[PDB]
């Protein structure tokens, strides 16, 4: 299907405890592949997927260089923002940055993004034309002006439409067995009495990849949106994902209920019934 490469960066100040904590991670789709942690022993960009381990010392040294530079700039950024917002030196604050690219079915560029948050709120974002900025307030408009005069959108556009996409494709190819797979959910249903007059029916989707899925309950064909307990999709830890949806069913009505499963691994959506 579609694919994405994204990098995520968190920088957190911690006053009276020296240097800001810096964490960087990279994903292709729902698969993490690199990390850097500023409090770790190594001080290196490190592999987190088997298919990126084959990249040579040039890759690893180049990524380590860039990531240690980012660490430094975000440390400066934290002071800058504290200055913009008139904040005291004694409080802990968070800058987050995320960028990357989307490709379609045919591995051709679909969209690029490059966005920052300060203290969990949108701060500045590259718009979809990759040429202009959304700035939240006066502080972020301060940043926008710096970036327009340094032509930051231009360099970012070149990266997002070229290099990003090129490297996404290489990773896709190199990690074919992991990244280009589609794992259909393994599904089952459980039934548990909560009283003598009610039971929970729970429809499970297990070991699926990628993470995108729709799980819904119907009663005589009408959606039970308001009455379904639905958990957030969650990582199993082996590179696959899980989800369940549950309904409370008055005893004797189990056959009215259907669980519906859509995932890119399923040729046709599944309909499951307790019977």
């Amino acid at each position: 299907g579609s694919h994405s490469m994204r990098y995520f960066f968190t920088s957190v100040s911690r006053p009276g405890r020296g240097e800001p904590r810096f964490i960087a991670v990279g994903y292709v789709d729902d698969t993490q592949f690199v990390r850097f942690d500023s409090d770790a022993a190594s001080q290196r960009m490190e592999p987190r997927a088997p298919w990126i381990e084959q990249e040579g010392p040039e890759y690893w040294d180049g990524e380590t260089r860039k990531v240690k530079a980012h660490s430094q700039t975000h440390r400066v950024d934290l002071g800058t923002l504290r200055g913009y917002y008139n904040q005291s030196e004694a409080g802990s604050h968070t800058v987050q940055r995320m960028y990357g690219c989307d490709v379609g079915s045919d591995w051709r560029f679909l969209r690029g993004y490059h966005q920052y948050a300060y203290d969990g709120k949108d701060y500045i974002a590259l718009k979809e034309d990759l040429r202009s900025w959304t700035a939240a307030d006066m502080a972020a408009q301060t940043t926008k002006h710096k970036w327009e005069a340094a032509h930051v959108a231009e360099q970012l556009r070149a990266y997002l439409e070229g290099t990003c996409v090129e490297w996404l494709r290489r990773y896709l190819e190199n990690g074919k067995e992991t990244l280009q797979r589609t794992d259909a959910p393994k599904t089952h249903m459980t039934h548990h009495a909560v009283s003598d007059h009610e039971a929970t029916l729970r429809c499970w989707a297990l070991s699926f990849y990628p993470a995108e899925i729709t799980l819904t309950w119907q009663r005589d064909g009408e959606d039970q949106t308001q009455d379904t307990e639905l958990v957030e999709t969650r990582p199993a830890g082996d590179g696959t994902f899980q989800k369940w949806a549950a309904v409370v069913v008055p005893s004797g009505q189990e056959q009215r209920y259907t669980c519906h499963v859509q995932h890119e691994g399923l040729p046709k959506p599944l309909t499951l019934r307790w019977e």
């Binding site: 990098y7 800058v95 500045i124 490297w167």
Partner: peptide
């Protein structure tokens, strides 16, 4: 592969 820079805020 990352973008080379983080532009200062």
């Amino acid at each position: 592969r990352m973008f080379p820079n983080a532009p200062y805020l």
